[PDB]
Amino acid sequence: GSHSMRYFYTSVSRPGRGEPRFIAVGYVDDTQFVRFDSDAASQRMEPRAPWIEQEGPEYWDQETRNVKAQSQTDRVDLGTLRGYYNQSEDGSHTIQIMYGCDVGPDGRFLRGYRQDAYDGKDYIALNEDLRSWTAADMAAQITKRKWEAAHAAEQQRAYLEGRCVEWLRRYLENGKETLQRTDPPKTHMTHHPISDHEATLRCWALGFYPAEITLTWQRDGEDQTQDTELVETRPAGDGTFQKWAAVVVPSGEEQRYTCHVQHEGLPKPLTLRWE
């Protein structure tokens, strides 16, 4: 199937407490496989997946160096943006960077990504053409022209069209044992009365991977939104994910409601009824 490699960088300045906290995580689909933490004693990029652990020392030495480079780049930019936004040097601030590349079932390039944020808001984003940028404020126009003048898009597109998808093919190949799995959801339903005239139905789906899934509650076949409750998709902690969707029904009317579970690892959609 299609796959994506995604890196998530977060650098948070901590005035009066030392250099900013730098956190890097590497993903293939929803499977984390590398990490770096500025506060951890190792000062190395550390493996978090079994198929990445075989990578030679040259890999870990290079990945640690380059992610350290991204750590110094973030520290410089925090002050540069502090000047752009004219904010006190005493306050803590946040820069979030996400980038990555997608490939299709043939391993051929589909899309490239690069998004940078400041204090939880969009700052600059690499456009789909991988040749131009989108600015969110006057401060980003400063960076936009700088990167237009410095030709930053030339470096990002080269990696995203090259080393990004090239190594995504290698990770998916060396990790074919785990990354090509489609774990179907294990579903069930629970029933709790709230009063003499109402009750709660909660449709479950556990142990599924990847996390993309659809839970739909219908009454007489029509999708219901009122009196529904849908929580975040959550990881079980073993490489699988969990989700549930609820609906409040009048007592004696449970039979009219159906939960519809759609997932990639299921050959055909499941329909759960209160039996």
């Binding site: 890196y7 380059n66 480079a69 991204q70 930019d77 700088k146 990696y159 090259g162 080393r163």
Partner: peptide
């Protein structure tokens, strides 16, 4: 792997 070595300052 990570970015093509060099990074451009903001």
């Amino acid at each position: 792997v990570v970015v093509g070595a060099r990074g451009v300052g903001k």
